[PDB]
Design a protein around this nucleic acid. Structure first.
Length: 48
RNA sequence: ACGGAAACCUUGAUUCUAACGCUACUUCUAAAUAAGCGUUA
């Protein structure tokens, strides 16, 4: 009594779904032609 | 020097045996972390 469909989604453009949170500029590094988002806990552990 | 004297209403006995506060029941129902970019330059 159940019908199952498969929906294949091909993005034709950028698609953003947020969670309400935002990276601040004190949280990512722009270098080597890339944006690096480190883990803040790991960064702090290496910085202590 | 009294129809009086002497004489335990006393001994032994478990208010005990058996028995599920149990049977059935979805913390469930819909819901894009999303909308607006004006005016000046």
């Amino acid at each position: 009594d159940y019908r199952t469909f498969k929906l294949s989604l091909l993005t034709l453009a950028p698609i953003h779904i947020g969670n309400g949170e935002k990276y601040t500029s004190r949280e990512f590094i722009y270098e080597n032609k890339k944006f690096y988002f480190p883990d803040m806990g790991k960064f702090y552990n290496k910085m202590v």
